[PDB]
A paper describes a structure:
[name] ([name]) belongs to the ubiquitous family of La-related proteins, which controls the metabolism of many RNAs in the cell. [name] also includes a highly conserved [name]-specific region in its C-terminus that contains at least one [name] box (also referred to as a unit, motif, module or repeat). We have shown that the [name]-specific [name] region, a sequence that is highly conserved among [name] proteins, but does not appear anywhere else in the proteome, specifically binds the oligopyrimidine-rich sequence present in the 5′[name] of RPS6, but not the 5′TOPs of PABPC1 or RPL13A. The structure of the [name] region from human [name] suggests that its unique amino acid sequence has evolved into three [name]-like helix-turn-helix folds for RNA binding.
We also present the crystal structure of the [name] region from human [name], the first structure from [name], which provides evidence for its RNA-binding capabilities. The crystal structure contains four copies of [name] in the asymmetric unit in two pseudo-dimers; ∼98% of the amino acids are ordered and visible in the experimental map. Our crystal structure reveals three structural repeats that correspond to three [name] modules, which we have found to exist in nearly all [name] protein sequences. The structure of the [name] region reveals a positively charged patch containing conserved residues. While it is uncertain that [name] exists in the cell as a dimer, the crystallization of the [name] region as a pseudo-symmetric dimer revealed a positively charged cleft comprised of the concave surfaces of two monomers, which allowed us to hone in on the probable RNA-binding amino acids.
Author numbering: 796 to 943
The structure:
């Protein structure tokens, strides 16, 4: 019934439903402020899941853009949703360009004093042939400090 639900259903995504829904969410974030819109939070979660099966560059880029913006103000749900999209999405369908973004956002997250991104990056890499790809050498040191 709520757009998030019917847009995620099988064969239930329509451009028309989605676009009104999106603007409503962005309007509410503008109206109420960063971190204060629960509707915004639902959009982050929608993007997180939907992009796994139905990638769209434009949607993906906004998702990332808004996530980083919110996180800079200390509101992290968006970025958390982003790291789950990277970690879970890449294990399902790997994409080189997205993997490079995952490395980029993980290093920044780590250098900002957080471990959420690094753990998600390790959870994916540990079990993937992606570990044999060219990894940011700084990220590789950060992953070294992950011994148990």
């Amino acid at each position: 019934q709520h757009p998030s639900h019917e847009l995620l259903k099988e064969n239930g995504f329509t451009q028309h439903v989605y676009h009104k829904y999106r603007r409503r969410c962005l309007n509410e974030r503008k109206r109420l402020g960063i971190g204060q819109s629960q509707e915004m939070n639902t959009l982050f979660r929608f993007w997180s899941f939907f992009l796994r099966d139905h990638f769209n560059k434009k949607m993906y880029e906004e998702f990332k853009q808004l996530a980083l913006e919110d996180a800079k103000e200390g509101y992290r749900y968006g970025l958390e949703c982003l790291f789950r999209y990277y970690s879970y999405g890449l294990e399902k369908k790997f994409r080189l360009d997205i993997f490079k973004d995952f490395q980029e956002e993980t290093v920044k997250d780590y250098e900002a004093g957080q471990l959420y991104g690094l753990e998600k990056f390790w959870a994916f890499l540990k079990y993937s042939k992606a570990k044999n790809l060219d990894i940011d050498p700084k990220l590789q040191e950060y992953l070294g400090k992950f011994r148990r």
